[PDB]
Write a protein that binds this DNA or RNA. Sequence first.
DNA 1: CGATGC
Length: 276
Amino acid sequence: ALYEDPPDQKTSPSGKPATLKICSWNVDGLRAWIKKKGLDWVKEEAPDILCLQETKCSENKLPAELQELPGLSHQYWSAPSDKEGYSGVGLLSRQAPLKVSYGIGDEEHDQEGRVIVAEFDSFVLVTAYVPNAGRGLVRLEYRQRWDEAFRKFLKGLASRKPLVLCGDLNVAHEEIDLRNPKGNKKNAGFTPQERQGFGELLQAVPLADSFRHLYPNTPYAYTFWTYMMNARSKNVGWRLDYFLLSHSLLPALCDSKIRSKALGSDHCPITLYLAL
DNA sequence: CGATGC
Ligand SMILES: [Mg+2]
């Protein structure tokens, strides 16, 4: 049915003003996204940090428009070593992070340009494009190994500094997170193994699902719609894109937004407001 | 993976 993202809440349960705006977007290919004017939307959104997934673009063959982005001048990219036109992520920031790194410290999982880590003064930001299980659960064995390695890597990071994880985690956690839970219970993105992995991640690290924490029973809020059969026009979708937070950041959480109407990809952007 | 039609 209907999802209308509520107005932007820019103050925390404390009462402090939001100071940081992070936007995450699976752009389904940088060049296609830019031609659909995705950068015009980003300029209006004016995030402090922009995280992109499925750039599908080699680090050294980036569109020139990305140079023309004045408030996001510190830009870091990662793409597959072997593959091209496949996966790829980016992290663009108004202020320079203290340190950047790539991957999750495990060679097997670090070959596909999926993870960038950006350390800031008071928190560490990870953006991720999580591996897809495959039409029919083909790579679901690999994906369960990814989940375990990813969880271990993130618990490590969170033990040193408060953690914000964002991006396309490629799972709808609960039935409320997709339109057809029944028909997809053996499809990539909604297998019990993927959902259990996600739940493990929440409590093991631990991390809070920022959107679901603020809006525990808001249904029909999705971040992805298959282009097939114009699913988006019908709001037949999945919530695959998240901001997960360390519990210590929850007093900082102002809002977690789903930018339902922003066009340019088969995912829409999500945006996080933190008071730091 | 939404649509389909045991
Ligand atoms: Mg995709």
